[PDB]
């Protein structure tokens, strides 16, 4: 054939990949502490002899969007929201250290703090709270525990949440949705990120997802139009080859 069909076909398939990324972003429009994935087409030119005429296209995801999200006021002392460019630290699935923005902190029957089922990490490691005690979280992450039955004079600090500062260019979303330091950024900032004392959190507010609707809509419209354009090129190339095959007769 004329491999021009293999260019428009790639452009049509990567458009479906982009649509699958955008639809995934739209599905998580209500996920607490969600970071939308950025999608971008990139052109790769095929090198060779003689005339460079073919340039294929692939969909890539250049990190995520770190724009602080919406803040819903839920009058719950455990749901916290972070200052812009600030991350909470939890223990990842494989016993590693991961970063998140979901402040929906839950207390188990044994007293351990968890986020989405992952243990919460402080300066002393995972945080264990006295069993069945009221928890208040300060602006700088200090945790006060009140034991029921005892007077409010008993309120004393227990542990401090680990709050780190990381930009978009330094973190990469792992396969389980937890952000981790990229290789270059890890090599310069060390393996574990030191807690930043300047990070402030707000207790009683939960951060929503930063999925922008207007950009999503425009992206879907553009993707549909591009897919139709590639289909019209594919049809034209197929029609051309069908007659060109007549040259072999007689």
């Amino acid at each position: 054939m004329d491999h021009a069909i293999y260019t428009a076909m790639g452009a049509a398939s990567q458009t479906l990949n982009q649509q699958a990324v955008t639809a995934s972003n739209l599905a998580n429009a209500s996920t607490p502490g969600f970071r939308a994935q950025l999608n971008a087409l990139r052109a790769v030119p095929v090198d060779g002899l003689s005339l460079a005429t073919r340039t294929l296209v692939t969909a890539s995801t250049p990190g995520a969007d770190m724009t602080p999200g919406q803040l819903d006021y839920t009058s719950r002392p455990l749901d916290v929201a972070l200052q812009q460019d600030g991350w909470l630290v939890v223990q990842a699935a494989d016993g590693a250290e991961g970063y998140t923005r979901n402040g929906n902190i839950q207390v188990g029957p044994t007293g351990q703090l968890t986020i989405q089922g992952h243990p919460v990490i402080g300066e002393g490691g995972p945080i264990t709270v006295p069993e069945g005690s009221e928890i208040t979280i300060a602006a700088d992450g200090t945790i006060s525990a009140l034991n029921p039955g005892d007077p409010p004079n008993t309120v004393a600090p227990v542990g401090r949440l680990k709050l780190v500062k990381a930009e978009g260019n330094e973190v990469q979303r792992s396969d389980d949705g937890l952000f981790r330091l990229t290789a270059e950024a890890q090599a310069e900032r060390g393996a574990v990120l030191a807690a930043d004392p300047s990070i402030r959190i707000m207790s009683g507010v939960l951060e929503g997802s930063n999925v922008k609707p207007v950009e999503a809509m425009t992206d879907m419209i553009a993707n549909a139009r591009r897919f139709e354009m590639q289909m019209k090129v594919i049809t034209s190339v197929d029609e051309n080859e069908g007659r060109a095959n007549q040259l072999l007769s007689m």
Binding site: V44, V46, D47, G48, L49, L51, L56
Partner: peptide, 21 residues
Amino acid sequence: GVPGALSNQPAPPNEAPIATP
């Protein structure tokens, strides 16, 4: 040589890098 002609040696391998090293 000119395109469509005959040469004495094979064309070099064709590769498209997504990101240059």
